Amino acid sequence: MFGMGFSEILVIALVAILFLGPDKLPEAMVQIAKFFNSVRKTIN
């Protein structure tokens, strides 16, 4: 995916788990889902 290997994705996930953590990771996930839903409803 544009010069981004699977291991690099795993490292990004690792950094997200480490630095966001038990809190703010579900919050970030729900924010990303809300942004994606807003994009989908705007492009509809």
């Binding site: 290997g5 699977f6 690099e8 966001l20």
Partner: protein, 239 residues
């Protein structure tokens, strides 16, 4: 609605593309000079490390591993120099595109910022070349000097050198945008400290995007970005 915003965008993209083409023509006319400038640090480091190796004992040089190699290196250097030459024209066309959307105060906020950012980028590129590139190249050649023979090929070297200059320019720019946002007032040290958790994830995403699919390159690119973020926090704190 989108008809004028497509017609004008088309005309401005045409002007920018013509500027890039003219810049590429000029750059290919002077590609020997530009390639000599780009390769001067490599030759200097090779000669210095050759002297060091001969002192230790008492060879390496620039190669081409493809023919499309040398011709395409000339074309690649000319293309980048063409983009650089056209960059004022592209930026001016983008400003004309964006300007009728900004208010009068935003105009004064932006244009000096553009000049300062461009100057900082230039200072970063010059610093990269004149200070960093000699010492870094000498260190890196001497690192494998007692094991391998440095048959450095121009094809990978041109890209590596261009990344070094572009990255150092961007590295000089990012602190200045932090300092500008701290002066005008949109961020504080608390903002930069409280958004580090997401900043590091975005930094690793950027490192993955800007590097080959290897993880080690990703970490090697993330480390300078984290250091730049910390320097930015310090700058905003003292402002």
């Amino acid at each position: 609605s989108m008809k004028p915003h497509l017609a004008e965008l088309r005309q401005r993209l045409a002007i920018s593309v013509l500027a890039v083409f003219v810049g590429f023509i000029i750059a290919f006319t002077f590609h020997n000079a530009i390639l000599g400038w780009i390769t001067k640090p490599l030759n200097n480091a090779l000669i210095q490390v050759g002297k060091i190796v001969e002192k230790r004992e008492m060879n390496g040089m620039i190669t081409t591993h493809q023919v499309g190699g040398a011709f395409f290196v000339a074309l690649k250097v000319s293309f980048f120099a063409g983009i650089l030459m056209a960059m004022p024209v592209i930026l001016w066309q983008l400003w004309l595109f964006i300007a009728p959307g900004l208010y009068d105060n935003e105009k004064k906020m932006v244009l000096p910022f553009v000049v300062g950012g461009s100057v900082m980028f230039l200072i970063g590129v010059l610093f990269a070349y004149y200070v960093v590139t000699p010492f870094g190249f000498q260190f890196l050649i001497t690192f494998g000097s007692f094991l391998y023979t440095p048959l450095i090929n121009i094809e990978d070297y041109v890209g590596f050198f261009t990344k070094i200059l572009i990255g150092f320019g961007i590295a000089f720019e990012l602190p200045v945008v932090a300092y500008f946002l701290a002066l005008l007032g949109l961020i504080t040290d608390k903002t930069l400290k409280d958004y580090f958790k997401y900043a590091i994830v975005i930094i690793f995403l950027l490192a993955a995007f800007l590097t080959p699919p290897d993880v080690l390159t990703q970490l090697l690119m993330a480390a300078p970005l984290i250091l730049l973020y910390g320097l930015s926090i310090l700058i905003v704190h003292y402002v």
